[PDB]
Design a binder for these strands. Structure first.
Ligand SMILES: [Zn+2]
Ligand SMILES: [Zn+2]
Length: 684
RNA sequence: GGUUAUAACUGAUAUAUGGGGUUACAGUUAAGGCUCUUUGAAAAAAGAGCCUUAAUUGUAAAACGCCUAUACGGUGAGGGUAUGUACGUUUGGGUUUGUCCAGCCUAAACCUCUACGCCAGAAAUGGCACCUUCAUUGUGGGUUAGGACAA
DNA sequence: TAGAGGATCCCCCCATATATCAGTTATAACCGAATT
DNA sequence: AATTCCCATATATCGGGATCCTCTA
């Protein structure tokens, strides 16, 4: 064990860690891990909820300020009605809720701020009011309560010292002198002058000019995405428990992910070198400008005129299920086509692109996605290619900190090299079971010596327990699972969609197109439910599909806005109990953190009894009363607690609380869960 | 090979909004039911009341809590505004708990680093905004749907 | 008539600006250490 | 003092409950 080498295979969702010794190429430890993949969705979803909450708070402040001013100038406000009785004041208050957008100048639910202001001004003028009041009202509409601060944010530290890195927009003079030091390299200097310069220097103002010949340190990485950061931490967690206390580390290698994102994103393998400089976007333009040029500044879906003030970059492939922000996934949507699509497949949406602009597109990738949105699934580009490539740094530094040896050697191995040895030593790369990642890790750590006559040497084969080569299904341990725990204080208290609880039944309103096929029995209406079933049978729609906009209109499901929009139906919500219902203010939500543990106590008679402990943060918000603890509690059960049955010696892990906890064996059981009452269960 | 620079390419974190949708309440309309009164031999019809299901209008709520009233806004009158001020520096605080952190927000004291936006002239910079003082009049403000460890 | 086993049920969407970093591809500049 | 830069198409692809119907002592 003189030389120990650890091989790490970094992947988008699975990472394989293996450590072997180069003395005889013997496998000492090999295990693949599974990283959390819901962090990106959770972080994105949290931001939307936070933005919506802050947006509503600003609306309340704007409405309160407008109401106070309206009352001052002669308005009468009634608390019961909540709005002014006078028509000029009532209209202004009503228009304040939807003030429109003002991020672009003027060249429909959301039309513009100017149109709303013009509508506001017209109703104020008709009310015989002074221009001073109109100006003040307009100022309230355009008033900003929370100022935007995007300048001076996320300051970069210098490579040598800790001083703040100056912004590149005040460095344009310095960057010009960096090229004139030496000596087609003629258009390079033009770029710094006449375009945006986003990105810090990674250096301060005293080392960048003259001390640029400081090539002694690695590229420091200070900022990492939380989803990518927790993926590395989960991998490092496995290393600390097993690799750290068992064996020492002398060398570490990693699989370099040269996915060629600039090449696989266009539906090709590797385009020309000269075509890498010029991307899909037009020269001297943005994504919106480039999208309009390919559509001739019109709309693909409806053909109406599109300007920069209303152009939307739609995702032909919805982001609700999949969705990738590529140039070939966004074409055009002006005001209503985006609203009608609302994040669903165009084939399922039914708003087919007009066959007059598709033939005018010069991009071959756009042809396939528009004809069939499902083609992106068969594309050779995935979001995990960037996930695997991004994050190779900030891992060696953390590895060096954990295991010491700040002078650790870092090497990168390409996937082509490990493929040669895998197919030559007698290994098969199966796209099925995930145990094949530990083997990539072993080939990553294995000594590479061809010798012989140009063929891979057979005496350097990795060894199993004693000499039995390396078997994925025989010489591997259990692959670790990293999941999300909802028992913490950071988990959501309830669902984001309020529910209606009238006459002791949980119901909610759902769109006709949003109703899944085969689940129409929940509709309370005895006439629209039959109509929905008839439409499904007539059009020949299987289970799991929806109704398109054209099909819904032709089936009489469009009597919402003068025959120009789909309606909504009130249907009962399945898979919900009374204990999950919590009422906050006038809203009612369904919760999932209502159970925090199982408490077992002694009854008055003497027999043991089990109850469910409720969340302290939601105890007073429960619609129905719960059951408390009467006798003395002997023990309290919790999630992730190793328990055993009264008539068995196996170890089980509790997954669900309640009077009948659900338990599952740590090793084995083929993933099947076991349900048993807590009375006949004991905690180990 | 490393570092850095210029293009481009995806990946994912904050920020500030524009909508759709959901729920509560209060009106209106349509259709379908249940009762009462009444026209009526009867058939039947009308009026009134209630319910259900759709369409429509307005208003309101959207995590619990914790912290802050020594706080947080409106109006009017002064001053300060690259010599300045914080999105910056230094030491802290709130969220914040069994413990620690992220992300936001913020106090006192300071310009070494970092950043400093809009609307208007014919060189003279004016308004807005920001900061601050005072008076008057209100009850507001921040954070919270993420990650670890421990019980 | 009570509790497990076994079906199937349940979760919010679109977009517009404003900033930033972290990876890849290409070209160019050097720096540097190994290799020849 | 001139040259190499590890050998040498591949790598990446809910959880925590709930009801309903069916068995079992
Ligand atoms: Zn420096
Ligand atoms: Zn359109």
């Amino acid at each position: 064990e003189k030389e120990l080498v650890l091989g790490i295979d970094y992947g988008g969702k699975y990472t394989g860690l293996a450590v072997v010794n180069q003395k005889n190429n013997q496998v000492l430890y090999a295990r693949t891990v599974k990283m959390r993949d819901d962090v990106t969705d959770i972080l994105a979803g949290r931001r939307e909820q936070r933005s919506l909450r802050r947006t509503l708070q600003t609306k309340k402040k704007r409405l309160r300020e407008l109401k106070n001013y309206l009352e001052s100038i002669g308005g009468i406000y009634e608390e019961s009605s909540g709005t002014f009785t006078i028509e000029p004041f009532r209209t202004v208050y009503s228009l304040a809720h939807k003030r429109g957008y003002d991020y672009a100048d003027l060249p429909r639910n959301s039309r513009h701020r100017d149109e709303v202001l013009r509508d506001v001004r017209n109703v104020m003028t008709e009310g015989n009011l002074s221009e001073e009041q109109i100006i003040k009202v307009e100022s309230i509409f355009n008033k900003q309560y929370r100022h935007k601060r995007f300048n001076n944010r996320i300051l970069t530290k210098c490579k040598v010292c800790g001083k703040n890195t100056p912004l590149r927009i005040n460095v344009r003079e310095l960057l010009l002198e960096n090229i004139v030091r030496y000596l087609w390299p003629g258009k390079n200097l033009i770029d710094i002058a006449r375009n945006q310069l986003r990105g810090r220097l990674l250096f301060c103002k005293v080392h960048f000019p003259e001390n640029e010949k400081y090539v002694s340190i690695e590229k420091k990485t200070f900022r990492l995405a939380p989803s990518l950061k927790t993926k590395i931490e989960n991998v490092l967690s496995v290393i600390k428990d097993d690799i750290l206390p068992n064996f020492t580390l002398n060398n570490v290698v990693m699989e370099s992910n040269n996915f060629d994102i600039a090449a696989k994103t266009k539906g090709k393998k590797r385009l020309l070198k000269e075509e890498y400089s010029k991307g899909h976007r037009e020269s001297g333009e943005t994504r919106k400008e480039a999208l309009l040029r390919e559509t001739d500044s019109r709309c693909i879906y409806c053909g109406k005129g599109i300007d920069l003030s209303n152009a939307h970059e739609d995702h032909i492939f919805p982001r609700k299920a999949g969705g990738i922000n590529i140039f070939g996934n966004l074409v055009a949507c002006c005001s209503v086509c985006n609203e009608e699509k609302r994040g669903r497949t165009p084939l399922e949406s039914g708003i087919l692109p007009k066959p007059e602009i598709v033939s005018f597109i010069t991009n071959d990738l756009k042809k396939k996605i528009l004809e069939d949105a499902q083609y992106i699934n068969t594309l050779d580009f995935n979001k995990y290619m960037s996930h695997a490539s991004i994050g190779w740094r900030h891992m060696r530094d953390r590895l060096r900190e954990l295991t010491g040896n700040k002078e650790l050697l870092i090497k990168r191995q390409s996937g082509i090299y490990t493929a040669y040895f895998r197919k030559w030593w007698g290994f098969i790369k199966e796209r099925g079971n995930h145990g094949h990642h530990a083997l990539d890790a072993v080939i990553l750590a294995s000594k590479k010596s061809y010798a012989e006559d140009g063929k891979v040497d057979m005496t350097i084969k990795p060894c199993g327990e004693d000499g039995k080569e390396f078997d994925i299904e025989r010489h591997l341990s259990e692959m670790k699972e990293f999941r999300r725990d909802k028992g913490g204080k950071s988990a959501p208290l309830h669902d984001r969609n309020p529910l209606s609880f009238k006459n002791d039944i949980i119901t909610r309103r759902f769109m006709v197109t949003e109703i899944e096929c085969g689940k129409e029995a929940v509709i309370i209406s005895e006439e629209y439910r039959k109509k929905l079933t008839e439409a499904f049978k007539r059009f020949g729609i299987a289970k799991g599909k929806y109704l398109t906009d054209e099909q819904a209109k032709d089936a009489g499901f469009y009597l919402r806005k003068n025959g120009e929009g789909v309606m909504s139906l009130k249907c009962e919500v399945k898979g919900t109990g009374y204990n999950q219902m919590i009422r906050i203010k006038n809203n009612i939500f369904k919760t999932n953190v209502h159970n925090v543990g199982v408490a077992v106590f002694l009854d008055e008679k003497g027999k043991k009894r089990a109850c469910e402990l409720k969340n302290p943060r939601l105890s007073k918000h429960f619609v129905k009363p719960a059951e408390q603890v009467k006798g003395k509690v002997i023990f309290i059960l919790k999630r992730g607690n190793m328990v055993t049955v009264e008539g068995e010696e196996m170890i089980y892990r509790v997954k669900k609380l309640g009077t009948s906890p659900v338990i599952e064996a740590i090793v084995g059981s083929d993933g099947k869960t076991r349900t048993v009452s807590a009375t006949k269960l004991l905690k180990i």
